[PDB]
Amino acid sequence: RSFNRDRRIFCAILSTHSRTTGINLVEADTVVFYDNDLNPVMDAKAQEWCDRIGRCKDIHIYRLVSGNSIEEKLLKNGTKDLIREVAAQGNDYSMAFLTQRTIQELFEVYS
Amino acid sequence: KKYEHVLKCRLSNRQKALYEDVILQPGTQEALKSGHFVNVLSILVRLQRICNHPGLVEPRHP
């Protein structure tokens, strides 16, 4: 509310693991996603709340990525699907859901 | 209205050094060759935390 009422505070810095995305009004007109979130429930709630802000008025959303790092690979929905696959009965298995090809080819540098 | 932007940022030399150190450690290479979900997850919770800012993995002490 302080950030909404006062037009001088340039940016509100916000954590994806916060809970009160139930607040419908945020006055600022851009969002920067500094990082990806490995946990997909937090990621989904963060995106959904940012799209709610975008519905309230036009915004620019910004996604930063390191060019050569693994973060480009986490951008793909398949990595989230990997975590989703491991989420089912991830206690009694051998923790070998990540196949060797998937691990190596997800990170390996190619021309 | 919604406009999507993805911006590529070049990692610094200190970030490159810590990144190559974590990758080339044998404890990472063995996990890559053999495979284990918790080990790869820990490798990423290291490497991406480096990738955000190397001060979270080794802060500059006074």
Curated annotation (Swiss-Prot), chain A:
Tissue expression, per UniProt? Ubiquitously expressed.
- Where in the cell is the protein located? Nucleus
* Entry coiled-coil feature ranges: none
* Residue stretches spanning the membrane: none
**Residue ranges constituting the Helicase C-terminal domain according to the UniProt record:** 1-99
Q: What family is it from?
A: Belongs to the SNF2/RAD54 helicase family. SWR1 subfamily.
Under the subunit heading, UniProt states: Component of the NuA4 histone acetyltransferase complex which contains the catalytic subunit KAT5/TIP60 and the subunits EP400, TRRAP/PAF400, BRD8/SMAP, EPC1, DMAP1/DNMAP1, RUVBL1/TIP49, RUVBL2, ING3, actin, ACTL6A/BAF53A, MORF4L1/MRG15, MORF4L2/MRGX, MRGBP, YEATS4/GAS41, VPS72/YL1 and MEAF6. May also participate in the formation of NuA4 related complexes which lack the KAT5/TIP60 catalytic subunit, but which include the SWI/SNF related protein SRCAP. The NuA4 complex interacts with MYC and the adenovirus E1A protein. EP400 interacts with TRRAP, RUVBL1 and RUVBL2.
General function of this protein: Component of the NuA4 histone acetyltransferase complex which is involved in transcriptional activation of select genes principally by acetylation of nucleosomal histones H4 and H2A. This modification may both alter nucleosome - DNA interactions and promote interaction of the modified histones with other proteins which positively regulate transcription. May be required for transcriptional activation of E2F1 and MYC target genes during cellular proliferation.
| Name by which UniProt lists this protein | E1A-binding protein p400
| UniProt source species | Homo sapiens (Human)
Record gene name: EP400
| Region of the whole protein represented | 1958 to 2068 of 3159
